[PDB]
Assembly symmetry: D3
Homo-oligomer: 121 residues x 6
C-alpha cells in the first residue's frame, strides 16, 4: 500500500471552504504514480483514469488519508485504485470515504517506450 496524509488548508480549498476537486485528483494521481513506480521499479506515466467518484465533501481543516493499491497488472500497464478518507480528530466522529478512483499507469524505458512490469501477487 501507498499512503499519504494531508491537513486541508485554505490554499487547497475552493470558495466553499472544501477541498477543491482538482486538488483531490492531483493527489490521487500522485499516489497512483508512487504505487506504480514502486511496483514497476522504473519510470511510469499516467495514461488513463476512470470512475472517480466524489462522494462526500472534505471540509477546511480536515485530515485526509490517501491509500493507493495495485489492483491488476497487464504487460506494461498497471491499474491502481485510490481512496481518500477523511479522519475525524474529535472523539466520537468516525472516518468516512470521501472519494475513490482508478488509474492506469504505464512503465516506460529510457526511450519512453512501454516496458514490461513484474506480475502482481
Amino acid at each position: 500500500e501507498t499512503r499519504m496524509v494531508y491537513p486541508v488548508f485554505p490554499g487547497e480549498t475552493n470558495h466553499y471552504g472544501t477541498l477543491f476537486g482538482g486538488t483531490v485528483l492531483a493527489w490521487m494521481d500522485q499516489a497512483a504514480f508512487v504505487a506504480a513506480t514502486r511496483h514497476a521499479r522504473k519510470k511510469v506515466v499516467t495514461v488513463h483514469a476512470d470512475a472517480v467518484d466524489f462522494k462526500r465533501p472534505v471540509p477546511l481543516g480536515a485530515i485526509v488519508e490517501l491509500v493507493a493499491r495495485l489492483k491488476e497488472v497487464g504487460r506494461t500497464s498497471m491499474r491502481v485504485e485510490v481512496e481518500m478518507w477523511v479522519e475525524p480528530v474529535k472523539e466520537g466522529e468516525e472516518a468516512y470515504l470521501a472519494a475513490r478512483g482508478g488509474f492506469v499507469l504505464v512503465a516506460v524505458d529510457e526511450r519512453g517506450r512501454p516496458s514490461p512490469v513484474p506480475p502482481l501477487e
Copy 2:
C-alpha cells in the same frame, strides 16, 4: 464553450520535463467547473470523472489549450467533456490532442442541496 490557455513551465512538470498528469486533471476539472457554473448559474461541485485518456505527452514549454463543452444535462447534473490540445509555435508545426476526459458536475443551493439546472440548448 469554455477555454483556457497555459504556457507549460517547470513548476507544472514532472521530473521527465512533461506536464504532470495531476496538473492536467486539476486544469480539466477547473475548466469543467467554469463551464458547468456558467450553464447552471449556481454553485456547482464535481461528483464524478471518467474516461480520462492521456494520449500524448506535453513537453516543457508547450502552449496548451483546454476546451470544455457541455455534452448533456440531467436534472441537477451536467456532463462536461474537456479536451487539452497542444498548440505548436513553430511555423507549419503540428497541433494535436494530448488528453480528453469527461466530468459530471452538480448544481447545489446555498444549503448544499442539488438544484435543477436549465435544459441543454
Copy 3:
C-alpha cells in the same frame, strides 16, 4: 484573441478576500505571453508593461475571464492589451471590466536576440 478563465479560490486572494493584485498581473502577463507567442511563432519575452488599471475588486468565488489582443506590431516587438472581466453567475447580474493593461513582448532567436515578427492584420 487569447482567452483564459479562472474561478477565484482562497489561494489566489489577499487577506481582504479579493483577488490579489500581484496575481492578476501574473495572469495578464501569461495571457500576453501566449498571444504574443501565437503571433510571432517563436520564443518571446516580456520587456515592458504600462497603464495597468485595477478598476474594481474581484471577490472570492468570482469567475474571471482574461482576454488578450495584439494591438500593434513594430519589428521584433508586439503590444498586447489584456482585459480581465468578472462574469457573474447569478441571473440578473452582468459582467464588468475589473482590470486592463498593456504589455510589450519581444520575439527572440535561439541566441536570445530580438527577432522579427510577422506584421499584424
Copy 4:
C-alpha cells in the same frame, strides 16, 4: 505512525536539482502536525523544532517517504520525530535516510489555550 510519500518534481527543488531544504522542513512539520493531531484529538500548533539534520541530498525524481512518530508526551505538549527516506526505484538499488528532525507540538482548546493530551501508550 504517520506516513506521507512524495515524488520529487522540479517545483520543489532548488537550482541544484535537489529537494529544497525549506520544502523538507515544511513537509516534516506537516507530518508532525498530523501525527500530533491524531494523538491529541484536538487542534494542535507547532511550538518548537530542533535537531533537524540534512544528511544526504534528495535528487530530482526521487521518491521520498516521511515517517512521523510520537516520541514523548508531557501535559499539553508532544514531541514527534520525523524521518525522511528516499526510496530508490531501480532494482536492488539503495534506500537511505536523507533527513531527520524533532518537533514539539501543543494541543489547544477552541480558545487557543494549551489543553492536556492523552498519555503515551
Copy 5:
C-alpha cells in the same frame, strides 16, 4: 525602504530557465503593497501600475533583491517605485538592475472607501 530577497528556483522560472515575468510583477506589487501599508498604517490596494521595464533576464539560481521606495503621496494614494537587482554570488562578479516599475496604491477604510494617508516625509 522595503526590501525582499529571493533565491531564483525552478518553480519561478519560465521554460527558458529565467525568472518568469509574471512572477516579477507579483513580487514587485507585493513589495509596493508592504511599503504602502507601512506608510499609510491602513489597509491598502493597488489601483495602478505603470512603466515596468524588464531590462535584463534573471537566470535560474540568481539571488534577487527587491527594493520599494515611496516616491510621492497625494491624498489617499501613494506612488511606490520598485527595483529588482540581481546580486551575483561569484567574487568580484557583477550586480545589476534587472527590472523597475511604479505602482500606485490607495489606502481604504474598513468600509473599503479611500482614506487619507500621512504626508511624504
Copy 6:
C-alpha cells in the same frame, strides 16, 4: 543583514487563519540560504537547523519581517540566526518577535564537496 518582508495571505495559512509553521520554516531557511550565499560567495546547502521557537501566532493579514544574521563561521560551515517579526500597521500597536531559529549552512564546490568560507568580521 538579510531581510525579507511578506504580507500574510490565505494561501500561506493553516485552517486556524494563522501563518502555517511549515511555511515560516521554509521562509527562514530561504533567508538563511541567502545570507550564507552572500558570505560564502559560492553555492551552499542547509545541513542543520536547531532551536526553532514559535513564540506567538501570526494572524492572517499581518506583515512579517524576516531578518537573517551570520552568527559564527567554522571552516566550510556557517551558523545563521533568523528572526521573524510581525510589524503591526495600525497606530498604537508595536512589533513583536513571532519566531526565531538557527540554521547551519555549508558552502560546497562544483563537485558538491564542502568548501572553505571567508571568516566573519
